[PDB]
Amino acid sequence: SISISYSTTYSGWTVADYLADWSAYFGDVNHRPGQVVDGSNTGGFNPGPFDGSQYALKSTASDAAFIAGGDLHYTLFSNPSHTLWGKLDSIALGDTLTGGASSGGYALDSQEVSFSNLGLDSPIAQGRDGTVHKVVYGLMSGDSSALQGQIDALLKAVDPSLSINSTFDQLAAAGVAHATPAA
């Protein structure tokens, strides 16, 4: 089942309200034709270069960063071009990305919220229509709708009374979510 961690600061927040604010706070790194600059808005794989157990990206607007965890693959120019596919197990949201492939992994200095046991697995053949692609591209581009939908579905699958409109505290009472230390 989905496992959620949250800083005690966000106990009284709904998952939906947190993700709507986080998307806007991270914003859009503008990873699009004519707009890409290396080490500004590419992100990075661990270990890479085009595959990793992690894909991580820093905001160009704020200190926000995310880490996507699983078994992830990027196609670059190869058909289907510019597809992120594979297994997405976890999304970690917070501030101040540290480490990388040379440190044995990426870390957030301030992890606010994470979603684990997502169980998402998108094959290469789905291209940019894959759920993994849409979930992570949404985080890159200031629209967490796809992530919100997947979390909503996973919560309702544990118990139909749960949704992204539940507070983190309500999800903790339901045995899904776990409080972590405040920054």
PDB file of C-alpha atoms in Angstrom:
ATOM      1  CA  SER A   1       0.000   0.000   0.000  1.00  0.00           C
ATOM      2  CA  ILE A   2       1.005   3.677  -0.527  1.00  0.00           C
ATOM      3  CA  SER A   3       3.146   5.057   2.347  1.00  0.00           C
ATOM      4  CA  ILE A   4       3.226   8.838   2.984  1.00  0.00           C
ATOM      5  CA  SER A   5       5.744  10.763   5.106  1.00  0.00           C
ATOM      6  CA  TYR A   6       5.104  14.386   6.136  1.00  0.00           C
ATOM      7  CA  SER A   7       6.842  16.997   8.278  1.00  0.00           C
ATOM      8  CA  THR A   8       4.654  17.638  11.384  1.00  0.00           C
ATOM      9  CA  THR A   9       4.390  21.267  10.022  1.00  0.00           C
ATOM     10  CA  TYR A  10       1.912  19.939   7.365  1.00  0.00           C
ATOM     11  CA  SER A  11      -0.247  17.801   9.784  1.00  0.00           C
ATOM     12  CA  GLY A  12      -3.360  19.968   9.106  1.00  0.00           C
ATOM     13  CA  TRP A  13      -2.807  20.353   5.321  1.00  0.00           C
ATOM     14  CA  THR A  14      -4.727  18.310   2.744  1.00  0.00           C
ATOM     15  CA  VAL A  15      -2.512  16.376   0.303  1.00  0.00           C
ATOM     16  CA  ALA A  16      -4.235  18.315  -2.553  1.00  0.00           C
ATOM     17  CA  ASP A  17      -3.506  21.736  -0.957  1.00  0.00           C
ATOM     18  CA  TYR A  18       0.157  20.786  -0.274  1.00  0.00           C
ATOM     19  CA  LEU A  19       0.716  19.583  -3.884  1.00  0.00           C
ATOM     20  CA  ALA A  20      -1.080  22.631  -5.455  1.00  0.00           C
ATOM     21  CA  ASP A  21       1.256  24.950  -3.456  1.00  0.00           C
ATOM     22  CA  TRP A  22       4.369  22.779  -4.044  1.00  0.00           C
ATOM     23  CA  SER A  23       3.834  22.757  -7.888  1.00  0.00           C
ATOM     24  CA  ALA A  24       3.469  26.582  -7.878  1.00  0.00           C
ATOM     25  CA  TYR A  25       6.492  27.005  -5.487  1.00  0.00           C
ATOM     26  CA  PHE A  26       8.746  24.751  -7.645  1.00  0.00           C
ATOM     27  CA  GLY A  27       7.213  26.325 -10.796  1.00  0.00           C
ATOM     28  CA  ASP A  28       8.270  25.395 -14.352  1.00  0.00           C
ATOM     29  CA  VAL A  29      11.983  24.832 -15.195  1.00  0.00           C
ATOM     30  CA  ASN A  30      11.012  25.272 -18.937  1.00  0.00           C
ATOM     31  CA  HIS A  31      12.670  21.997 -20.120  1.00  0.00           C
ATOM     32  CA  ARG A  32      11.440  22.458 -23.730  1.00  0.00           C
ATOM     33  CA  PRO A  33      12.956  22.905 -27.228  1.00  0.00           C
ATOM     34  CA  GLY A  34      15.214  26.006 -27.416  1.00  0.00           C
ATOM     35  CA  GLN A  35      15.018  26.476 -23.598  1.00  0.00           C
ATOM     36  CA  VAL A  36      17.400  23.728 -22.286  1.00  0.00           C
ATOM     37  CA  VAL A  37      20.711  24.728 -20.558  1.00  0.00           C
ATOM     38  CA  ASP A  38      22.814  21.975 -18.870  1.00  0.00           C
ATOM     39  CA  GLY A  39      23.020  22.014 -15.036  1.00  0.00           C
ATOM     40  CA  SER A  40      20.254  24.692 -15.059  1.00  0.00           C
ATOM     41  CA  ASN A  41      17.083  22.737 -16.059  1.00  0.00           C
ATOM     42  CA  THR A  42      18.148  19.163 -17.129  1.00  0.00           C
ATOM     43  CA  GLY A  43      18.000  17.456 -13.726  1.00  0.00           C
ATOM     44  CA  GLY A  44      20.220  14.422 -13.182  1.00  0.00           C
ATOM     45  CA  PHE A  45      20.135  10.638 -12.896  1.00  0.00           C
ATOM     46  CA  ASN A  46      21.799   8.506 -10.239  1.00  0.00           C
ATOM     47  CA  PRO A  47      23.885   6.922 -11.532  1.00  0.00           C
ATOM     48  CA  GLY A  48      23.013   8.049 -15.097  1.00  0.00           C
ATOM     49  CA  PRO A  49      23.869   9.068 -17.611  1.00  0.00           C
ATOM     50  CA  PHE A  50      20.327   8.349 -19.074  1.00  0.00           C
ATOM     51  CA  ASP A  51      19.054   5.751 -16.523  1.00  0.00           C
ATOM     52  CA  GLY A  52      18.900   5.705 -12.727  1.00  0.00           C
ATOM     53  CA  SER A  53      17.403   4.496  -9.459  1.00  0.00           C
ATOM     54  CA  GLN A  54      16.818   8.277  -8.994  1.00  0.00           C
ATOM     55  CA  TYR A  55      15.973  11.274 -11.203  1.00  0.00           C
ATOM     56  CA  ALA A  56      16.305  14.585  -9.304  1.00  0.00           C
ATOM     57  CA  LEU A  57      15.595  18.202 -10.304  1.00  0.00           C
ATOM     58  CA  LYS A  58      16.079  21.591  -8.604  1.00  0.00           C
ATOM     59  CA  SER A  59      13.633  24.483  -9.213  1.00  0.00           C
ATOM     60  CA  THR A  60      15.019  27.481 -11.216  1.00  0.00           C
ATOM     61  CA  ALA A  61      12.529  29.759  -9.277  1.00  0.00           C
ATOM     62  CA  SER A  62      13.038  28.629  -5.602  1.00  0.00           C
ATOM     63  CA  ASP A  63      15.034  26.172  -3.383  1.00  0.00           C
ATOM     64  CA  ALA A  64      12.342  23.505  -4.134  1.00  0.00           C
ATOM     65  CA  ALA A  65      13.588  20.121  -5.430  1.00  0.00           C
ATOM     66  CA  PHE A  66      12.152  16.641  -5.987  1.00  0.00           C
ATOM     67  CA  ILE A  67      13.630  13.143  -6.212  1.00  0.00           C
ATOM     68  CA  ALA A  68      11.841  10.446  -8.252  1.00  0.00           C
ATOM     69  CA  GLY A  69      12.891   6.966  -7.035  1.00  0.00           C
ATOM     70  CA  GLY A  70      12.600   3.612  -8.819  1.00  0.00           C
ATOM     71  CA  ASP A  71      14.108   2.215 -12.049  1.00  0.00           C
ATOM     72  CA  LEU A  72      13.890   5.109 -14.536  1.00  0.00           C
ATOM     73  CA  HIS A  73      15.005   5.425 -18.179  1.00  0.00           C
ATOM     74  CA  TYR A  74      15.138   8.385 -20.595  1.00  0.00           C
ATOM     75  CA  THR A  75      15.100   7.885 -24.400  1.00  0.00           C
ATOM     76  CA  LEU A  76      16.550  11.330 -25.470  1.00  0.00           C
ATOM     77  CA  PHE A  77      16.388  11.294 -29.370  1.00  0.00           C
ATOM     78  CA  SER A  78      15.449   7.569 -29.659  1.00  0.00           C
ATOM     79  CA  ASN A  79      11.871   6.532 -30.634  1.00  0.00           C
ATOM     80  CA  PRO A  80       9.759   7.259 -28.654  1.00  0.00           C
ATOM     81  CA  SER A  81      11.809  10.482 -28.189  1.00  0.00           C
ATOM     82  CA  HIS A  82      12.075  12.338 -24.838  1.00  0.00           C
ATOM     83  CA  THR A  83      10.213   9.629 -22.846  1.00  0.00           C
ATOM     84  CA  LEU A  84      10.850   8.969 -19.123  1.00  0.00           C
ATOM     85  CA  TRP A  85       9.696   5.377 -18.495  1.00  0.00           C
ATOM     86  CA  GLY A  86      10.186   2.416 -16.130  1.00  0.00           C
ATOM     87  CA  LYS A  87       9.255   1.914 -12.453  1.00  0.00           C
ATOM     88  CA  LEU A  88       8.336   4.882 -10.211  1.00  0.00           C
ATOM     89  CA  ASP A  89       8.274   3.766  -6.523  1.00  0.00           C
ATOM     90  CA  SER A  90       8.679   7.139  -4.737  1.00  0.00           C
ATOM     91  CA  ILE A  91       8.427  10.940  -4.999  1.00  0.00           C
ATOM     92  CA  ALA A  92      10.194  13.060  -2.333  1.00  0.00           C
ATOM     93  CA  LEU A  93       9.415  16.810  -2.186  1.00  0.00           C
ATOM     94  CA  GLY A  94      11.252  19.495  -0.244  1.00  0.00           C
ATOM     95  CA  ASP A  95      14.058  22.069  -0.391  1.00  0.00           C
ATOM     96  CA  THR A  96      17.804  22.008  -1.162  1.00  0.00           C
ATOM     97  CA  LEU A  97      18.905  19.059  -3.344  1.00  0.00           C
ATOM     98  CA  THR A  98      22.273  17.574  -2.222  1.00  0.00           C
ATOM     99  CA  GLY A  99      24.539  14.717  -3.394  1.00  0.00           C
ATOM    100  CA  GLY A 100      24.067  12.795  -6.657  1.00  0.00           C
ATOM    101  CA  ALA A 101      25.654   9.797  -8.427  1.00  0.00           C
ATOM    102  CA  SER A 102      29.197  10.621  -7.072  1.00  0.00           C
ATOM    103  CA  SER A 103      27.828  10.742  -3.418  1.00  0.00           C
ATOM    104  CA  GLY A 104      25.988   7.358  -3.870  1.00  0.00           C
ATOM    105  CA  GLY A 105      22.616   9.174  -4.095  1.00  0.00           C
ATOM    106  CA  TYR A 106      20.549  12.372  -4.090  1.00  0.00           C
ATOM    107  CA  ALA A 107      19.094  13.731  -0.824  1.00  0.00           C
ATOM    108  CA  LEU A 108      16.925  16.717   0.208  1.00  0.00           C
ATOM    109  CA  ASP A 109      18.399  18.915   3.013  1.00  0.00           C
ATOM    110  CA  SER A 110      14.720  19.545   3.993  1.00  0.00           C
ATOM    111  CA  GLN A 111      12.331  16.715   2.977  1.00  0.00           C
ATOM    112  CA  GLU A 112       8.751  17.959   3.603  1.00  0.00           C
ATOM    113  CA  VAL A 113       6.558  15.200   2.051  1.00  0.00           C
ATOM    114  CA  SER A 114       7.156  11.842   0.364  1.00  0.00           C
ATOM    115  CA  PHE A 115       4.982   9.224  -1.349  1.00  0.00           C
ATOM    116  CA  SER A 116       6.382   5.635  -1.403  1.00  0.00           C
ATOM    117  CA  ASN A 117       5.103   2.242  -2.737  1.00  0.00           C
ATOM    118  CA  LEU A 118       3.525   4.095  -5.721  1.00  0.00           C
ATOM    119  CA  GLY A 119       3.785   0.831  -7.772  1.00  0.00           C
ATOM    120  CA  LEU A 120       3.837   2.742 -11.106  1.00  0.00           C
ATOM    121  CA  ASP A 121       5.415   0.903 -14.091  1.00  0.00           C
ATOM    122  CA  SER A 122       5.211   2.463 -17.602  1.00  0.00           C
ATOM    123  CA  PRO A 123       6.674   0.522 -20.570  1.00  0.00           C
ATOM    124  CA  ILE A 124       8.805   2.292 -23.241  1.00  0.00           C
ATOM    125  CA  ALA A 125       6.061   1.552 -25.876  1.00  0.00           C
ATOM    126  CA  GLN A 126       3.626   4.082 -24.210  1.00  0.00           C
ATOM    127  CA  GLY A 127       6.125   6.928 -24.870  1.00  0.00           C
ATOM    128  CA  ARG A 128       5.130  10.323 -23.373  1.00  0.00           C
ATOM    129  CA  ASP A 129       1.586   8.882 -22.745  1.00  0.00           C
ATOM    130  CA  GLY A 130       3.033   6.694 -19.912  1.00  0.00           C
ATOM    131  CA  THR A 131       1.803   7.502 -16.372  1.00  0.00           C
ATOM    132  CA  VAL A 132       5.439   7.668 -15.076  1.00  0.00           C
ATOM    133  CA  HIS A 133       6.294  10.260 -17.801  1.00  0.00           C
ATOM    134  CA  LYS A 134       3.162  12.377 -17.096  1.00  0.00           C
ATOM    135  CA  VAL A 135       3.613  12.240 -13.267  1.00  0.00           C
ATOM    136  CA  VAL A 136       7.296  13.337 -13.301  1.00  0.00           C
ATOM    137  CA  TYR A 137       6.953  15.820 -16.263  1.00  0.00           C
ATOM    138  CA  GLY A 138       4.098  17.450 -14.259  1.00  0.00           C
ATOM    139  CA  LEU A 139       6.545  18.036 -11.356  1.00  0.00           C
ATOM    140  CA  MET A 140       9.141  19.506 -13.829  1.00  0.00           C
ATOM    141  CA  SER A 141       6.566  21.873 -15.428  1.00  0.00           C
ATOM    142  CA  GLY A 142       4.400  23.240 -12.532  1.00  0.00           C
ATOM    143  CA  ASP A 143       1.359  20.917 -12.891  1.00  0.00           C
ATOM    144  CA  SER A 144       1.079  18.092 -10.288  1.00  0.00           C
ATOM    145  CA  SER A 145      -2.419  16.993 -11.576  1.00  0.00           C
ATOM    146  CA  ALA A 146      -1.058  13.553 -12.706  1.00  0.00           C
ATOM    147  CA  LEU A 147       0.669  12.897  -9.326  1.00  0.00           C
ATOM    148  CA  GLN A 148      -2.471  14.125  -7.448  1.00  0.00           C
ATOM    149  CA  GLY A 149      -4.637  11.672  -9.487  1.00  0.00           C
ATOM    150  CA  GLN A 150      -2.349   8.666  -8.830  1.00  0.00           C
ATOM    151  CA  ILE A 151      -2.149   9.412  -5.046  1.00  0.00           C
ATOM    152  CA  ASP A 152      -5.957   9.925  -4.901  1.00  0.00           C
ATOM    153  CA  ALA A 153      -6.458   6.501  -6.620  1.00  0.00           C
ATOM    154  CA  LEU A 154      -3.917   4.692  -4.327  1.00  0.00           C
ATOM    155  CA  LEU A 155      -5.556   6.206  -1.155  1.00  0.00           C
ATOM    156  CA  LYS A 156      -9.119   5.199  -2.231  1.00  0.00           C
ATOM    157  CA  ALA A 157      -7.686   1.657  -2.927  1.00  0.00           C
ATOM    158  CA  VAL A 158      -6.540   1.366   0.788  1.00  0.00           C
ATOM    159  CA  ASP A 159      -9.963   2.618   2.021  1.00  0.00           C
ATOM    160  CA  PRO A 160     -12.708   4.379   0.016  1.00  0.00           C
ATOM    161  CA  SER A 161     -13.075   7.081   2.793  1.00  0.00           C
ATOM    162  CA  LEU A 162      -9.520   8.378   1.979  1.00  0.00           C
ATOM    163  CA  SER A 163      -8.589  10.897  -0.750  1.00  0.00           C
ATOM    164  CA  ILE A 164      -6.133  13.726  -1.504  1.00  0.00           C
ATOM    165  CA  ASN A 165      -8.730  15.934   0.303  1.00  0.00           C
ATOM    166  CA  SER A 166      -7.774  14.080   3.567  1.00  0.00           C
ATOM    167  CA  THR A 167      -5.290  15.894   5.865  1.00  0.00           C
ATOM    168  CA  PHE A 168      -1.895  14.255   6.529  1.00  0.00           C
ATOM    169  CA  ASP A 169      -3.089  13.800  10.177  1.00  0.00           C
ATOM    170  CA  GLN A 170      -6.260  11.949   8.952  1.00  0.00           C
ATOM    171  CA  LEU A 171      -4.046   9.703   6.717  1.00  0.00           C
ATOM    172  CA  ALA A 172      -1.774   9.037   9.784  1.00  0.00           C
ATOM    173  CA  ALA A 173      -4.910   7.996  11.786  1.00  0.00           C
ATOM    174  CA  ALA A 174      -5.778   5.645   8.825  1.00  0.00           C
ATOM    175  CA  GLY A 175      -2.255   4.053   9.042  1.00  0.00           C
ATOM    176  CA  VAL A 176      -1.087   5.333   5.575  1.00  0.00           C
ATOM    177  CA  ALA A 177       0.965   8.414   6.621  1.00  0.00           C
ATOM    178  CA  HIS A 178       3.821   8.950   9.138  1.00  0.00           C
ATOM    179  CA  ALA A 179       5.024  12.265  10.698  1.00  0.00           C
ATOM    180  CA  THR A 180       8.719  13.219  10.260  1.00  0.00           C
ATOM    181  CA  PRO A 181      10.585  16.037  12.070  1.00  0.00           C
ATOM    182  CA  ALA A 182       9.779  19.711  11.285  1.00  0.00           C
ATOM    183  CA  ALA A 183      12.604  21.787   9.648  1.00  0.00           C
TER     184      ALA A 183
END
